[PDB]
Amino acid sequence: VQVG
Numbered sequence: 532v533q534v535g
């Protein structure tokens with residue numbers, strides 16, 4: 532998971 533990548534959130535930016």
Ligand code: NA
Pocket residue numbers: 532533
């Ligand atoms: Na990912």
